[PDB]
Design an enzyme around this catalytic site. Sequence first.
Site, short mmCIF file in Angstrom:
data_model
loop_
_atom_site.label_atom_id
_atom_site.label_comp_id
_atom_site.label_asym_id
_atom_site.label_seq_id
_atom_site.Cartn_x
_atom_site.Cartn_y
_atom_site.Cartn_z
N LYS A 131 21.97 28.18 74.21
CA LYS A 131 22.45 26.81 74.25
C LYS A 131 23.18 26.49 75.54
O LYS A 131 24.25 25.86 75.54
CB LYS A 131 23.29 26.47 73.02
CG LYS A 131 22.43 26.56 71.75
CD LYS A 131 23.26 26.38 70.47
CE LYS A 131 22.45 26.58 69.17
NZ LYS A 131 21.83 27.95 69.08
N1 LIG Z 1 20.01 27.63 67.46
C1 LIG Z 1 20.35 27.17 66.24
C2 LIG Z 1 20.50 25.81 66.07
C3 LIG Z 1 20.85 25.39 64.78
O1 LIG Z 1 21.00 24.19 64.57
N2 LIG Z 1 20.99 26.23 63.75
C4 LIG Z 1 20.84 27.57 63.90
O2 LIG Z 1 20.98 28.32 62.92
N3 LIG Z 1 20.52 28.08 65.17
C5 LIG Z 1 20.36 29.53 65.42
O3 LIG Z 1 19.25 30.11 64.72
C6 LIG Z 1 19.59 31.35 64.13
C7 LIG Z 1 19.56 31.22 62.61
O4 LIG Z 1 19.52 32.53 62.08
P1 LIG Z 1 19.49 32.85 60.49
O5 LIG Z 1 20.33 31.76 59.87
O6 LIG Z 1 18.06 32.80 59.97
O7 LIG Z 1 20.11 34.22 60.44
C8 LIG Z 1 20.97 31.68 64.71
O8 LIG Z 1 20.80 32.33 65.97
C9 LIG Z 1 21.60 30.31 64.97
O9 LIG Z 1 22.69 30.39 65.90
#
Ligand SMILES: Nc1cc(=O)[nH]c(=O)n1[C@@H]1O[C@H](COP(=O)(O)O)[C@@H](O)[C@H]1O
Lengths: 321, 330
Positions: free
Chosen positions: B145
Amino acid sequence: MGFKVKLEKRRNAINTCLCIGLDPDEKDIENFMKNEKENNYNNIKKNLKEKYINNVSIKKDILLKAPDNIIREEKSEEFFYFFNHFCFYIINETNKYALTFKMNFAFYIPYGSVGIDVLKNVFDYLYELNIPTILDMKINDIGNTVKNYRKFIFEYLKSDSCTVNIYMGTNMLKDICYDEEKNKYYSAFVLVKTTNPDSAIFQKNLSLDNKQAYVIMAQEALNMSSYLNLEQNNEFIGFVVGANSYDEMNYIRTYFPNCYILSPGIGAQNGDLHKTLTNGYHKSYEKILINIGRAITKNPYPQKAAQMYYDQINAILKQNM
Amino acid sequence: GLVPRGSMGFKVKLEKRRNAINTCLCIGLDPDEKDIENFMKNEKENNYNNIKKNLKEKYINNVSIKKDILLKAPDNIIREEKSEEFFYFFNHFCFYIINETNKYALTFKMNFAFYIPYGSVGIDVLKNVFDYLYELNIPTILDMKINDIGNTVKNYRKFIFEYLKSDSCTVNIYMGTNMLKDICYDEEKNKYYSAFVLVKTTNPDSAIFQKNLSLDNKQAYVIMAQEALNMSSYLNLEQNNEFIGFVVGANSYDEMNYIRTYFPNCYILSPGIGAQNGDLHKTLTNGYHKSYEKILINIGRAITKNPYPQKAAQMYYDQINAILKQNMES
Ligand SMILES: Nc1cc(=O)[nH]c(=O)n1[C@@H]1O[C@H](COP(=O)(O)O)[C@@H](O)[C@H]1O
Ligand SMILES: Nc1cc(=O)[nH]c(=O)n1[C@@H]1O[C@H](COP(=O)(O)O)[C@@H](O)[C@H]1O
C-alpha cells in the site's frame, strides 16, 4: 511520559521547531564514501569519538572499526558501514538545532535488509540522545495487519511517532496508536494536505457537505484521537500539512487551534518558510514542526545548513510572538 | 514464438498461468509470529519432515540470502546456529507453504507488514521468498500500500521491482496519481510495471472516506478508479503488457458490481475471503470476467493457518473453480 511531554521538554531546551529529515539516497552515501577518502576519514574519525556509538544494536563491532580496515578486511560490510556512518555524521553535526528527526522509511528499504539494520541503529542512536523521532512510512492497512507496523515502529525501533495514511478509514488508528494488552499509547501524524503538485485531485476536489476532503479527514482523525483518549495519555494524532499549502495551513490552524502539525516541503520543494511558519504558528511551537531534509543532508556542510534554518525559524518565531 | 520466463509483461504472465491452471485463486502469504513459532514446534516434534522436503527442492539453491544457513540440517541450526534459528524457521515456513500450495495458485500475495516487525531478518526472508517464486515462475504481488511524493516513492519502485523482482504491488493513490509515474514507470530504464490501487477496502469503516466523499454525485472510490485508469492510459501501460488494476474487498458486493459494470475490462484484486468471512459466490459473481485473472480472489489465513495447507488450498481452488463454472455456464 508521552510524546506531548517529550516535545514540550525538548522545545524548552533548544527553543526551535526545526525537524531535520534524514532521507539518505544512494548518491549521498556514495558521496560520503568519496569525500571521506579525500579527507582522511575525518568525519568517521569524529563519529568514533562520540560516546553513544557504543550503544547501537546492530554490528557495533563493524561500526567501530577503522575505515582502512573495513575496506580491506570487511568489504562486504562497506556499504553498511558508510551508510550508517553517514547517518551518524548528519545526526552528530545537526542534533543541537533539531526539535525532532524524521526518517523516511523509503530510503532505508531499497537495498533489502542492510538499510533496515542502519535504520535500527539510527533509532537506537537518537533514543540514546533522547531526541524525539518520527518514522515517516505513511502506513495503512486493515487492523490485524497494521498491528505489525505498530510493533516495528513502536516496539522494535522505539519511535515516538509515525505518519499514517487514513484513506482506508480511521479505525486503523486503534491498532497503531493504542496497544490494549500493554496499555500503551503512541502518537501519529495523518496525511491531510500533501506537497505533490497534483495533491488537489482528491484532497481538495472531493468533498462532504461543503467541506473539502482534507478537512473531513483532519476532523475524523481528531474524532478518533478523542475516542482513544490519546491526549489524556500525553500522546496525540496530528496532521501532515505541506509547507507549500498556505490556504490549508491557515485553515487547519484557524479551525483546529491546538492541533499538532508536521510540515514538509521547504528547501528542495520550494515551499516558503516565512509563510508556512506564520500560517501554522502556535505559541507552543512544537505544534508546527518545520521539516527540512535534502536542504540539510545534500549540503556539503550540514551543520551550517541546520544552523541557518534554526536561526531563521527563530527570527520568524520572534516576529510572531 | 516462445517467450522465456521473466521476459514478458505481467498481463501475459497472468493470462498464460490462467490458461494453465484455470483458476483465479490468489494465495496470501502473511506469516505471523504464532505461525512461525507453531511451525518450529511442529517440525521439532516430527524430525523436521517438512523442512527436509523443502531442502529437496531444486530451486532452494537459487535464492539470494544466507543459503549457507538455509541449507543446513535443522538439528545443526538449533545446536550450532541459535542466532539464525528464527531466520531459518521463518524462511522454511514460507517455503513449505509455497511448496504445498503453489500448484493451485494463480498468484501469491505477500503483505510486507508481516515481514518487517523483527527488523532486517524478515526482509531477508522476503527476498528469498520472492527469489523462490521467481524461480518457480509464479506471478507475485507485494502488498505494501505504498504512497509518497515522486522522488521518495522511486525508492519503493527499486525495492519492489528491482530488488524483489515482483510483478506487481498495491498502491494508495490518495496523495494523487502523479506518484504512479514513479511506480509503474522507470524513465531511466524505460521499464513499465503493474500495480493495484486501493479502491474499496474490507475494513469495517471503509465507507468513511471511500463512499462518503464525492465529486458531482460520484463517490470517491469511483473517482479514484477512473483517475487511476486515466494515468494507465497516459503511461501506455497496456501497450507494454502491464496494467493498473483495483483492490475491491470481497465483502463490498455493490461496489464490485459498479466497478465491473463501469470498467468492464479492469483487473480486480479481491481480499476478504476466509478469515474475514466475505461471501465467495457473491464476490466472484459480481466481479466475474471471462478472463479469470481479472478477478483475483485472495485467501490467506484460511490456507496458511490450516494444519494441511495443501488440502486447504485444493478446497478453495475447487470451490472457486465451481463458481467460475457456474458463471461460465451463463
Ligand atoms: N490489501 C488488503 C486490502 C483490504 O481491504 N483488505 C485486506 O484484507 N487486504 C489484505 O489482504 C490480506 C487478507 O488476508 P486474509 O484475511 O485472507 O488472511 C491481508 O494481507 C490484508 O492486509
Ligand atoms: N510526508 C511527506 C508529505 C508531503 O506532502 N511531502 C513530503 O515531502 N513528505 C516527506 O517529507 C520529506 C521532505 O523531504 P525534503 O523535500 O525536505 O528532502 C520526505 O521524506 C517526503 O517523502
